[PDB]
Amino acid sequence: KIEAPALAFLRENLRALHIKFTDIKEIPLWIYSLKTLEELHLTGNLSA
Amino acid sequence: KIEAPALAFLRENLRALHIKFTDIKEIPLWIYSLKTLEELHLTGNLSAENNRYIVIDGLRELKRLKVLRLKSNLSKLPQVVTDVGVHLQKLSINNEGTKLIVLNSLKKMANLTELELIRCDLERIPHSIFSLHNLQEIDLKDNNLKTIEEIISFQHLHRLTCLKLWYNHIAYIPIQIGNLTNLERLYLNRNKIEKIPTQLFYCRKLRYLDLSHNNLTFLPADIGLLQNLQNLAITANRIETLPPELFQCRKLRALHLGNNVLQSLPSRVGELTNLTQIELRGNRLECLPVELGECPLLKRSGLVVEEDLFNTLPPEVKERLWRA
Amino acid sequence: GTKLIVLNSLKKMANLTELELIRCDLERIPHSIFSLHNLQEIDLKDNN
Amino acid sequence: FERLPADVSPINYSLCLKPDLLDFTFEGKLEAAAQVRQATNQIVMNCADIDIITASYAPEGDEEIHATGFNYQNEDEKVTLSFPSTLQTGTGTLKIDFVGELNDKMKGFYRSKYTTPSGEVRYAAVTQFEATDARRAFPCWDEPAIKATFDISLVVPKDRVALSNMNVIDRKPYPDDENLVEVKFARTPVMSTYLVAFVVGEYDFVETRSKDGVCVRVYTPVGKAEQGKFALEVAAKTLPFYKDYFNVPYPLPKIDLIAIADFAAGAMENWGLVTYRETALLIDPKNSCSSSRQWVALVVGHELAHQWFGNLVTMEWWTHLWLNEGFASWIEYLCVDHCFPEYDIWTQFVSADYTRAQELDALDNSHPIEVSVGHPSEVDEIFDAISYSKGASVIRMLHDYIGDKDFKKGMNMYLTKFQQKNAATEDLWESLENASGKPIAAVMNTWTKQMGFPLIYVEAEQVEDDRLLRLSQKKFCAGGAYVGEDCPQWMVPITISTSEDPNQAKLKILMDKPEMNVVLKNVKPDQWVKLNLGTVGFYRTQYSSAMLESLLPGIRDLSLPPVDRLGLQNDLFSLARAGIISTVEVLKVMEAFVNEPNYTVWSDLSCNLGILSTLLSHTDFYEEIQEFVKDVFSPIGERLGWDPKPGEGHLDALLRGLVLGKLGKAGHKATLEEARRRFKDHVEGKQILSADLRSPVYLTVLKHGDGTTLDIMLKLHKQADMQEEKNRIERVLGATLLPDLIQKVLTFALSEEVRPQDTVSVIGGVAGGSKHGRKAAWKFIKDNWEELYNRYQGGFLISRLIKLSVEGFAVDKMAGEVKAFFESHPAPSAERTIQQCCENILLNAAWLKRDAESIHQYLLQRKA
């Protein structure tokens, strides 16, 4: 869980993101709100 | 009963598993979720008394498995293992006296390269192993093999390098071994072998030989004809005389002679520059030749002889061996 | 360890320049990758 | 491929074979007495699955030399039993104690699944040695050329029933265990190894002595004797027919015709225990129609024919295998002709194989029947529908060209010549030439050499009472332009027939030259003389326009035989591509069918006209051809009415089904309204009609139906339980036309994968439902290529699927498109068929560009 100024800071600063989830719900929704993100090495059971 | 995150991490990291148990349910279910497994060993009776293999079916999803072990007294080879053996390499099967029926199921396995039917009481060659064309190391230990002529079929194979017959009741060694060429490390010790023919010696690629714990009486000179031997062992054999021609063969890193008969070690031992270890126990000997010290890689501990025979050596030679 | 199909989808990402199908078990080189010209690194690791 | 060194020739066999059920294993003794002609130390035994325990060879009277050879050439299915000492020459005996197993691959000596009336899903031991399978069961000389006598003896549980080639001669107890007994049969005569058969299971005894005295017997499981009674009568009638036919006694004092649950091979000729598939053989009186009885009679007589051609004189090698079946097939039809004269079987016989013979030779991959064989593995891909159909057609050709009595004499001499001895095809030709005198081999050598059937440009020259003309032999091409680099001409013995007598050919010439002349005495100035006679000559007679016009009155009425009419009808449709006028003449022959009552004529006419309708997609105007179909079907629909009519046979039921379905395809307003009426009556349950009418009613109502009817159809499929009824429902609901509906029924075909491996037929129906919708479904299955291939891994089902899907295409551009699609998607098993279809499509395109536009003009003359 994350706060709006933190979302902003991620928005202009975050470059790469790693995510590994046991279940779908573990994935935060705000991760897609990022724009400068260039790398996403997701891992889990995203077959859904 | 592993928890989900640890289960995932183990799925991504574990390489080898060794399951031993008594009851069938004892085997965890979650082990079948493992995906990076290559070494699997099972200990404890898998027999579910007909309609079996319901637990074992998880091996269908263990497609990354490479080596499998069955120490569980199987009357029949599972269909699951034959299905998964497309990519598999080693069947270390141990039946502890249970008779196993091959039922040509090994024919499915083609990528297989090492096969070991240990204590499976075949009493005969399976005759299905010859279908495999990538086998290299075959082991038939403690299976009551009486006549083993079927080994001629091995000439069809080309990747074979080691034929293992650790324990059996073989009486007469087939001459058809002469056709076999690519084998190197035959280990047919502990057998009712009265004599060895030259037909084994027509082979030239023999690295390791284990003619020990048998009823051998004499050694043909053709052992010296072999020019690729490294380690030899004629222990517990009724060897009255050791032929000097054996000593022509070089590159003999070790040479076992235990529980032999009254003999006389030839001075030609000097042509054993590659000797590093040797035993001279259990045989009636009285004068070890001085040329033993000629060996450049021979250690006091390396040469295993009775103390008195060690004493019969010249004192300076004894010092040389001791300092080694 | 699971099977995947390109289903001609790979031809859409014209900007793709580096592809690999790790343990994707294709047993066959997909035809979709051929039409793409930007590739430089290709891996078909452990695909039987 | 290497055959065998054959250093020792077997003489006699003694096989104390012991199946072990509940373990699926097999033991035996294999004591074979043989003669060592070649002085060699090595013995070659072709066998794959067996694991030899011990072997010992005792020559003559002295002691045996045991065995010192076990070379297992597993890939070659060979074993070398070398011995320390030479075996020189003499008669010896090889005893081979061994072990084998009941495979689950339904091969050699396998185990089949069967269900007792209570259940228990037990297993039984069954055999089949088609080619290189006898050696898998137990080691012998698995070579058709090799011939020896066998003494099969079984070690079987006493509760279980056991049958073999010969009659039981001993039922001794088994000393080791008393729950099972040793059954010893009589010594088989000289026979091939692949013809050996013995089965063990649980069945019931149903015997019937013949006129000759042989007890023809069937052993249905669960004592369904009734199911297996009609076949008993058929066999008891046709075996004495053979006996009086060629005056040769039956070889085996006992003959059995057991069926096996899911034989998975259909049928197999064997010495006196010919096995059958349960569905093929047994017949429930209340769960069958007369056509099924006709089929079972056909199949039961086919293997009885194989009892003579085959068993008695086996083919020398698999190269001649085509004969052993092919010839027999034709024989079987003749047999039924002498058994059920009311069953006029030649009529459907022409439509049964001859049609695909004609259409398959037209295309590529038309390899000659006689292809040299070295390896028995080559049998599979040298085998096809052509190997049966063209072989039967040419052997019937030979029977006509020789005459019935002369062919009888030739067959009798050939059988008496090489009885129990392997013979080649050339030997049969030599015997036939000895019987008749005219050179059969001089034609058979070319028949083996080349590939296909010729054509003739007939002429017209009626000099008073001499209708002379010039037959011009040339090769046939599907498009019309044959390659003709070699000598395309043939020597087919086209047997002309005088049309004054429909069955009797007053004028008949054994013409065998590219050019010739005629000698006849004409009866009527318009004798409409029928070239060929009931298409006995496997051939595609091209009649000139004058010939067609002269024979037109003959086909307007029923004067011409129905077989001639249907043969001409099929010829004209095929000759639309090569012969000129085509559609224009096609229309005229259509006029004749204003009066045709014959069902088979309507069946192949509907096939042809549906081919035209689907093929005319790109140039549209379906309303014109459908209107023409309505014009054709007006008198037929009136005569048959709509409702079931008194005096209607099962053939008339097929008539009503086809006429209703095709009338709905045309889209008649009143017919469609009545079909919707009965659809409502059935779905409400107020009046539910016969399924035979019901399925075509479904096709008609969905031909102009919305999605609600489609959902009702899916529902009715859900409560429906009968498997083939549901399959019919699915294939007819594939015939929706609305584009949204066709996409929905494609996704519902993804839903209708419930039918086990019948999904292929369901999706074939949906592909054939529309014409442009067929192209949409082709794109759909492009999007679902992986699903189809994971549902069928290189089977005949998927080849049939793709052939059905692409058969309606007549555009070269998307022909190349689908060709590239198949190139990127290799399917080797179907591969041949693939390019076949491709070429067909190209031909289709060409044919369109030949006449489609002018077809419009013809319609302008039709309505005027």
Q: Given an 8 Å threshold on Cβ–Cβ distance, is C5 in contact with D786?
A: yes
Q: Which residue is associated with the tokens 């107020």?
A: D686
- Count other C-beta atoms under 10 Å from residue D274's C-beta: 23
User: Of the residues D77, D101, D143, D303, which is catalytic?
Assistant: D303
**Closest CB from D24, D53, D71 relative to B153:** D71
List Cα–Cα distances, D398 to D349, D395, D433, in angstroms. Answer: 17, 5, 11
Query: Is the Cα torsion angle D536, D538, D539, D540 positive or negative in sign?
Result: positive
H or E element: which one contains D555?
helix D545-556
For D823, nearest residue in chain C (alpha carbons): C31
Name every chain B residue with its beta carbon within 8 A of the beta carbon of D96. Answer: none
- Looking at the DSSP assignment, which residues form a beta bridge with residue D254? D215
SS3 D411: helix
As annotated, the binding site of D includes 130, 266-270, 302, 306, 325
What distance in Å separates the CA atoms of residue D395 and residue D359, rounded to the nearest whole number? 19
List Cα–Cα distances, B294 to A18, B241, D439, D730, D823, in angstroms. Answer: 67, 22, 93, 93, 73
Q: What are the E-state strand segments in chain B?
A: 16-20, 39-43, 67-71, 90-94, 114-118, 137-141, 162-164, 231-233, 254-256, 277-279, 303-304
Q: What is the token pair recorded at D548?
A: 């067609």
Interface of B with C (CB under 8 A): 35, 61, 63-64, 87
Show the CA angle centred on residue B171, arms to residues B165 and B176, nearest 5°.
Answer: 70
**Closest CB from D51, D68, D69 relative to B127:** D51
- Count other C-beta atoms under 10 Å from residue D589's C-beta: 20
Length of chain A: 48
Q: Which residue is associated with the tokens 């293999």?
A: B53
Q: What is the token pair recorded at D454?
A: 């010729």
What distance in Å separates the CA atoms of residue B45 and residue B53, rounded to the nearest whole number? 12
For A23, list phi and psi in degrees, rounded to 5: -135, 165
User: In terms of Cα–Cα distance, which of D131, D153, D125 is closest to D144?
Assistant: D131
Is B63:B84 a contact under the CB 8 Å cutoff? Answer: yes
Torsion, Cα D485 D489 D492 D493, to 10 degrees, reads -170
Buried b (16+ CB within 10 A) or exposed e, B133-162: eebbbbbbbbbebebbbbbbbbbbbeebeb
Give the distance, in angstroms, between the CA of residue D645 and the centroid of all CA atoms in the same chain. Answer: 34
Torsion, Cα B16 B22 B26 B31, to 10 degrees, reads 20
User: In terms of Cα–Cα distance, which of B129, B31, B32, B23 is closest to B72?
Assistant: B23
Name every chain C residue with its beta carbon within 8 A of the beta carbon of B35. Answer: 1
Decide: residue D282, CB within 10 A, 0-12 exposed, 13-18 middle, 19+ buried. Answer: buried
User: In terms of Cα–Cα distance, which of D527, D403, D397 is closest to D468?
Assistant: D527
What distance in Å separates the CA atoms of residue D565 and residue D591, rounded to the nearest whole number? 12
User: In terms of Cα–Cα distance, which of D306, D321, D324, D129 is closest to D235?
Assistant: D306
Q: What is the token pair recorded at D194?
A: 């692949």
Show the CA angle centred on residue D661, arms to residues D807 and D771, nearest 5°.
Answer: 30
What distance in Å separates the CA atoms of residue D660 and residue D662, rounded to the nearest whole number? 6
The separation between the first and the last C-alpha atoms of chain B, rounded to the nearest angstrom, is: 56
A/B interface, count of CB pairs below 8 Å? 5
For A44, nearest residue in chain B (alpha carbons): B8
Is D511:D494 a contact under the CB 8 Å cutoff? Answer: yes
Residue D719's contacts (CB-CB under 8 Å, 6 or more residues apart) are: none
What distance in Å separates the CA atoms of residue D591 and residue D632, rounded to the nearest whole number? 7
Chain breaks in chain C (C to N over 2.5 A) after: none
What region, left, alpha or beta, does residue D534 occupy, with left being phi > 0 and alpha being psi -120 to 50 degrees? left
Question: How many Å lie between the alpha carbon of A19 and the closest alpha carbon of chain B?
Answer: 13
Name every chain B residue with its beta carbon within 8 A of the beta carbon of A20. Answer: 8
Q: How, if at all, do strands A39-43 and B16-20 pair? A: unpaired
Is D568:D550 a contact under the CB 8 Å cutoff? Answer: no
Name every chain B residue with its beta carbon within 8 A of the beta carbon of D52. Answer: 127
Q: Which residue is associated with the tokens 């079916």?
A: B57
The 3 state secondary structure assigned to D194-234 is: CCCCCEEECCCCEEEECCCCCEEEECCHHHCCHHHCHHHHH
User: In terms of Cα–Cα distance, which of D118, D208, D291 is closest to D219?
Assistant: D208
Buried b (16+ CB within 10 A) or exposed e, D849-862: ebbbeebeeebeee
- Count other C-beta atoms under 10 Å from residue D818's C-beta: 20
Is B324:B296 a contact under the CB 8 Å cutoff? Answer: no
- Looking at the DSSP assignment, which residues form a beta bridge with residue D47? none
What distance in Å separates the CA atoms of residue D445 and residue D454, rounded to the nearest whole number? 16
Is D347:D562 a contact under the CB 8 Å cutoff? Answer: yes
What distance in Å separates the CA atoms of residue D624 and residue D863, rounded to the nearest whole number? 10
Interface of C with B (CB under 8 A): 1, 23, 25, 48
Q: How, if at all, do strands D254-256 and D215-218 pair? A: parallel
- Looking at the DSSP assignment, which residues form a beta bridge with residue D46? D78, D140
What distance in Å separates the CA atoms of residue D241 and residue D656, rounded to the nearest whole number? 36
Buried b (16+ CB within 10 A) or exposed e, B110-123: eebbbbbbbbbebe
Residue C6's contacts (CB-CB under 8 Å, 6 or more residues apart) are: C30, C31, C32, C33
- Looking at the DSSP assignment, which residues form a beta bridge with residue B281? B258
As annotated, the binding site of D for substrate includes 130, 266-270
What distance in Å separates the CA atoms of residue B38 and residue B40, rounded to the nearest whole number? 6
Q: What are the E-state strand segments in B227-270?
A: 231-233, 254-256
What distance in Å separates the CA atoms of residue D213 and residue D206, rounded to the nearest whole number? 15
Does C2 contact D at CB distance below 8 Å? no
SS3 D557: coil
What distance in Å separates the CA atoms of residue D769 and residue D767, rounded to the nearest whole number? 5
Q: What is the DSSP letter of C10?
A: G
Is D49:D101 a contact under the CB 8 Å cutoff? Answer: yes
What distance in Å separates the CA atoms of residue D522 and residue D511, rounded to the nearest whole number? 19
Decide: residue D177, CB within 10 A, 0-12 exposed, 13-18 middle, 19+ buried. Answer: exposed
Residue D484's contacts (CB-CB under 8 Å, 6 or more residues apart) are: D474, D475
Q: What is the resolution of this structure in A?
A: 3.2
What distance in Å separates the CA atoms of residue D662 and residue B137, rounded to the nearest whole number? 69
As annotated, the binding site of D for Zn(2+) includes 302, 306, 325
Decide: residue D767, CB within 10 A, 0-12 exposed, 13-18 middle, 19+ buried. Answer: buried
User: In terms of Cα–Cα distance, which of D789, D780, D779 is closest to D828?
Assistant: D789
Residue D88's contacts (CB-CB under 8 Å, 6 or more residues apart) are: D36, D39, D59
Give the distance, in angstroms, between the CA of residue D715 and the centroid of all CA atoms in the same chain. Answer: 36
Residue B280's contacts (CB-CB under 8 Å, 6 or more residues apart) are: B257, B265, B288, B303, B304, B305, B306, B309
B/C interface, count of CB pairs below 8 Å? 7
Angle between helix D759-769 and helix D739-751 axes, rounded to 10 deg: 180
Does C5 contact D at CB distance below 8 Å? yes
Is C33:C7 a contact under the CB 8 Å cutoff? Answer: no
Does C7 contact D at CB distance below 8 Å? yes
What distance in Å separates the CA atoms of residue D634 and residue D638, rounded to the nearest whole number? 6
SS3 D78: strand
SS3 D839: helix
What distance in Å separates the CA atoms of residue B185 and residue D25, rounded to the nearest whole number? 35
SS3 B256: strand
For C30, nearest residue in chain D (alpha carbons): D824
Decide: residue D748, CB within 10 A, 0-12 exposed, 13-18 middle, 19+ buried. Answer: buried
What distance in Å separates the CA atoms of residue A24 and residue B239, rounded to the nearest whole number? 74
What distance in Å separates the CA atoms of residue D328 and residue D718, rounded to the nearest whole number? 44
Interface of D with B (CB under 8 A): 24-25, 49-53, 67-75, 80, 82, 101
Does C29 contact D at CB distance below 8 Å? no
SS3 B278: strand
Q: What is the token pair recorded at D590?
A: 């259509």
Task: Tell me the longest C-alpha to C-alpha distance in chain A.
Answer: 32
Question: How many Å lie between the alpha carbon of B8 and the closest alpha carbon of chain A?
Answer: 8
Question: How many Å lie between the alpha carbon of C37 and the closest alpha carbon of chain D?
Answer: 18
Show the CA angle centred on residue D775, arms to residues D771 and D778, nearest 5°.
Answer: 130
Q: What is the token pair recorded at D152?
A: 């099969």
Is D505:D536 a contact under the CB 8 Å cutoff? Answer: no
Name every chain B residue with its beta carbon within 8 A of the beta carbon of D53. Answer: 124
Helix (H), strand (E) counts: chain A: 1, 2
Chain breaks in chain B (C to N over 2.5 A) after: none
List Cα–Cα distances, C27 to B37, D598, D783, in angstroms. Answer: 21, 54, 20
User: In terms of Cα–Cα distance, which of D789, D712, D797 is closest to D762?
Assistant: D797
For C23, nearest residue in chain B (alpha carbons): B64
Length of chain D: 864
User: In terms of Cα–Cα distance, which of B35, B36, B59 is closest to B46?
Assistant: B59
What distance in Å separates the CA atoms of residue D602 and residue D656, rounded to the nearest whole number? 11
Q: Given an 8 Å threshold on Cβ–Cβ distance, is D824 in contact with C31?
A: yes
What distance in Å separates the CA atoms of residue D762 and residue D781, rounded to the nearest whole number? 13
List Cα–Cα distances, D691 to D337, D430, D654, D721, D770, in angstroms. Answer: 31, 54, 12, 13, 23
Give the distance, in angstroms, between the CA of residue D258 and the centroid of all CA atoms in the same chain. Answer: 21
Concerning whether D303 is annotated as a catalytic residue, the answer is yes
Does B295 contact D at CB distance below 8 Å? no
Show the CA angle centred on residue D545, arms to residues D539 and D548, nearest 5°.
Answer: 65
Interface of A with B (CB under 8 A): 20, 22, 44
- Count other C-beta atoms under 10 Å from residue D182's C-beta: 16
Subunits that touch chain C (at least 3 Cβ pairs < 8 angstroms)?
B, D
Is D201:D278 a contact under the CB 8 Å cutoff? Answer: no
Name every chain D residue with its beta carbon within 8 A of the beta carbon of C33. Answer: none
Query: Is the Cα torsion angle D610, D615, D616, D618 positive or negative in sign?
Result: positive
Which method was used? cryo-EM
Is B112:B91 a contact under the CB 8 Å cutoff? Answer: yes
Q: For the residues of D727-791, what is the DSSP string, one character each?
A: HHHHHHHTT--SHHHHHHHHHHHHHTTTSTTTHHHHHHHHHHH-SHHHHHHHHHHHHTHHHHHHH
Q: For the residues of D112-169, what is the DSSP string, one character each?
A: EE---SS-TT-EEEEEE-SSS-HHHHS-B---SS--BEEEEEEEEETTSEEE-SS-EE
Name every chain D residue with its beta carbon within 8 A of the beta carbon of B104. Answer: 49, 101
Helix spans in D169-320 (H): 230-246, 278-281, 290-308
What distance in Å separates the CA atoms of residue D753 and residue B301, rounded to the nearest whole number? 76
Q: For the residues of D343-383, what is the DSSP string, one character each?
A: S-HHHHHIIIIIHHHHHHHHSS----S----SSTTHHHHH-
H or E element: which one contains D632?
helix D622-640
List Cα–Cα distances, B209 to B171, B188, B189, B203, B255, in angstroms. Answer: 18, 8, 9, 12, 10
Residues 64-83 of B with CB under 8 A from D: none
Is D539:D567 a contact under the CB 8 Å cutoff? Answer: no
Decide: residue D696, CB within 10 A, 0-12 exposed, 13-18 middle, 19+ buried. Answer: buried
Asked whether at least 3 C-beta pairs link A and B within 8 Å, the reply is: yes
For B30, list phi and psi in degrees, rounded to 5: -60, -20
Q: Which residue is associated with the tokens 């000596």?
A: D109
User: In terms of Cα–Cα distance, which of D61, D77, D62, D69 is closest to D96?
Assistant: D69
What distance in Å separates the CA atoms of residue C7 and residue B232, rounded to the nearest whole number? 61
Chain breaks in chain A (C to N over 2.5 A) after: none
Q: For the residues of B46-76, what is the DSSP string, one character each?
A: ---SSS--TTGGGGGT-TT--EEEEES--SB
Name every chain C residue with its beta carbon within 8 A of the beta carbon of D827. Answer: none
Q: What is the token pair recorded at B294?
A: 């000629």
